[PDB]
Amino acid sequence: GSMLIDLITSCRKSTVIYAFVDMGLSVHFKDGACVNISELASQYGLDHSRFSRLCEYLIKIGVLVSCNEGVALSEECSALADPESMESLMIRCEVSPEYWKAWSMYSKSLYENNSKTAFEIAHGKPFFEYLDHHELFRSNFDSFMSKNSDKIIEKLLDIYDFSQHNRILDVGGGEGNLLIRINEKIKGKHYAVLDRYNETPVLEDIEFINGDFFKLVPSGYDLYILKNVIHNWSDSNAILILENCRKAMDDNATILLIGTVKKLKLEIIDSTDILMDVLLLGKERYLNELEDLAHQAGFVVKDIKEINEKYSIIELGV
């Protein structure tokens, strides 16, 4: 059962990558620089032989590659060299006590018809409520989300004309990095961000609204953006968000759904689908499923545009 034992012990890959990132030595691996294990251990005060053993495993799983009298990050794993990279922040969330405690309650959550989220069962609060009481975890999560916007922003500005819109609300925009990046290219607009803040953010070019899209969505916007929001929610909660958007919107107003649309048979989509179930009782959805939500909320699909293998844009109207 060599394949089954490889699958069972898959978590050991995530935990050694976490350990590498957490040691704060990634700065020295930048631009594929060849780092000497001995020089690194002496500098940091690390156990040489034990750190060497870690490096050998990181080579075997393809994070590190052997270089002349040392080790370097593989080209595919170069992002780990930057501690503020999406991938560096992602691993901190992935093997967090928040995540693995939530995962432990997944099996229990699947048996219960009107289950609380596996996360709520584990922690006594739903995911976004929990973020209010955990500054460090929220900071890491919000920054991780901001770096996700950085990865698709170039492709986004190409395939959709944002200049046609004058009043733009980022619904669940968090730090508001989407509108920060859009603002860099598109100036002289009204940019607003709706989210839940302990302390409401302040920027010169972006307005921030401390609210709750289950209570109401602000009216007076001709574009409503929902990036990586819908997949956080059950069908009932998703419809309630779209319904609140509908009550806010006049007949000419646009909704942009930005995020994963299930179609390409990718493992990262399937695995993220199960994580959304664990954390939020959310899901990744097929177009027809998103279409069904849209219709029920009183919208129609006007257009679909592919960003990449993971992400598409869905333009809603009415």
Ligand X SMILES: Nc1ncnc2c1ncn2[C@@H]1O[C@H](CSCC[C@H](N)C(=O)O)[C@@H](O)[C@H]1O
- Of 48-107, binders to a copy of itself (CB under 8 A) are 50-51, 53-54, 56-57, 60-63, 74, 76-77, 79-80, 86-87, 90-91, 94-95, 97, 99-101, 103-104, 106-107
Tokens matching residue 270:
């399937």
Beta bridge partners of 191: 168, 206
Q: How far apart are the first and last CA of the chain?
A: 55
* Contact partner, 172, from a copy of itself, Na ion, ligand X, none, Cβ < 5-8 Å per class: ligand X
Interface with a copy of itself, residue 236, by CB under 8 A: no
- Member of 37, 206, 307, 316 binding a copy of itself (CB under 8 A): 307
Per DSSP bridges, beta strands 223-227 and 167-171 are parallel
* Residue with Cβ nearer a copy of itself (21 or 245): 21
DSSP result, 237-298: HHHHHHHHHHHH--TT-EEEEEEE-B-S--HHHHHHHHHHHHHHS----BHHHHHHHHHHHT
Q: How far is Cα 46 from Cα 300, in angstroms, rounded to an integer?
A: 59
Q: Smaller CB distance to a copy of itself: residue 1 or 188?
A: 1
- Please check whether residue 133 is in contact with residue 166, taking contact to mean a CB–CB distance below 8 angstroms: no
By a kind-dependent CB cut-off of 5 to 8 A, residue 256 interacts, out of a copy of itself, Na ion, ligand X, none, with: none
Alpha carbon distance 153, 160 (integer Å): 11
Residues near Na ion (CB under 5 A) are: 20, 23, 25-26, 277, 281, 283
- Shortest gap between Cβ of 105 and Na ion (angstroms)? 14
Beta strands in 84-232 (DSSP E): 167-171, 190-195, 206-210, 223-227
Is there binding between residue 164 and a copy of itself (CB under 8 A)? no
Closest approach, Cβ 190 to ligand X, in A, equals: 18
Pairing of strands 300-306, 223-227: unpaired
Smallest distance, Å, CB 50 to a copy of itself?
6
Among residues 134, 165, 190, 231, the one annotated as catalytic is 231
- Partners of 44 in the β-ladder: none
Instruction: Tell me how far apart the alpha carbons of residues 262 and 316 are, in angstroms, rounded to a whole number.
Output: 18
Listed ranges 126-134, 190-198, 238-246, 260-268: which one lies at the site for a copy of itself (CB under 8 A): 260-268
Judged by CB under 6 A, the stretch of 17-25, 76-84, 103-111, 189-197 that binds ligand X is 189-197
Q: What is the residue type of 239?
A: I
Q: Which one of 44, 57, 214, 286 is in contact with ligand X (CB under 6 A)?
A: 214
Indicate the residue among 29 and 311 with the shorter CB distance to ligand X.
311
Identified binder of a copy of itself from the candidate list 4, 31, 199, 202, rule CB under 8 A: 4
The set of residues, in sequence order, having a beta carbon less than 8 Å from that of 210 and lying 6+ positions away, is 195, 196, 197, 200
- Residues 145, 119: Cα–Cα separation, whole Å: 19
Residue 5 binding target from ligand X, a copy of itself, Na ion, none, CB below 5 to 8 Å by type: a copy of itself
Task: Choose one: 169-177, 188-196, 275-283, 296-304; the region binding a copy of itself (CB under 8 A).
Answer: 275-283
Q: Is 295 an annotated catalytic residue? A: no
Least spacing, CB of residue 8 vs ligand X, in Å: 17
Cβ of 186: how many Cβ atoms within 10 Å? 16
Say which entry of ligand X, Na ion, a copy of itself, none residue 212 contacts (CB below 5 to 8 A, set by partner kind).
ligand X
Burial of residue 47 (number of CB atoms within 10 Å: 0-12, 13-18, 19+): exposed
Backbone φ and ψ of 198, nearest 5° = -70, -40
- Supply the residues annotated as catalytic: 231
